[PDB]
Amino acid sequence: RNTLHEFKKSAKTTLTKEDPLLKIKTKKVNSADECANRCIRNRGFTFTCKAFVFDKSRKRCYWYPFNSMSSGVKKGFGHEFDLYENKDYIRNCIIGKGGSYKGTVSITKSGIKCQPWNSMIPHEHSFLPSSYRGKDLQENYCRNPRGEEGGPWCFTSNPEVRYEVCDIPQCSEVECMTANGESYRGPMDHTESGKTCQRWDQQTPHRHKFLPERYPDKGFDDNYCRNPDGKPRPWCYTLDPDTPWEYCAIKTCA
């Protein structure tokens, strides 16, 4: 299995609020991917895991309920640590239907302040968080708890408009490309047929010559679509063992 690709790596970094010790669940493991799975599946947690640090030497990983952007939390440094923040919480963009969007946009297309989900004012409604556990209906952030076609949306703070889609750019269009896209550096991580890009720093399921350390110019972070070798457009090794690689379909700057 695999979930490490769901995460945004920031090397030699770690996290800390400062609070009176505070519960920070920890456990020895073999790999970072092992931390990943536990994190996204939340098994044995009294809370939701947004990020986690892995200690490459001690081979321990620590699970956090917040991330580098959370309310008052300092970062740091550590030669032997790596921080892995879930992409669902930090991206400023959507893959397709936006079922997994957990960023912090709280404004509709037409620009209305969203109504908080813990509220029935102005609009009465069934989407209490209690019923949509793990869909993160917090504050008044746009969400898409049922994975429907409109993408993320929210109840509106205008009595007249009950709900409305939030205009969140698609990861394929936020940073746009140009020429053969050798300069593309945007955050798209899925291929044209919808397959999921394998992380450049990994050699599995596909072995490949592109070690990020040997290629400081190409932007081989995480699993983002890139074009190091001058194809007609950016591309990625996939997570399907049956397809070594595949083009990504990034929107051009028009």
Radius of gyration of the chain (CA): 20
In the three-class reduction of DSSP (H, G, I as helix; E, B as strand; rest coil), residue 64 is classed as strand
The DSSP call for residue 144 is -
For this entry, resolution in Å reads 3.0
Residue 126: Cβ within 10 Å count: 6
Tell me the C-alpha distance between 252 and 173, whole Å: 8
Strands 81-86 and 60-64: unpaired
In the three-class reduction of DSSP (H, G, I as helix; E, B as strand; rest coil), residue 48 is classed as coil
Which secondary-structure segment (H or E) carries 154?
strand 153-155
Question: Could you tell me how far CA 99 lies from the centroid of its own chain?
Answer: 12
Question: Which structural domains are found in the chain, ordered by start?
Answer: 1-90 (3.50.4.10), 91-174 (2.40.20.10), 175-254 (2.40.20.10)
Q: Which residue has the tokens 């640090």?
A: 53
Distances (CA, A) of 205 to 12, 31, 223: 25, 16, 13
Q: What angle do CA 183, 91, 242 make, to 5 degrees?
A: 70
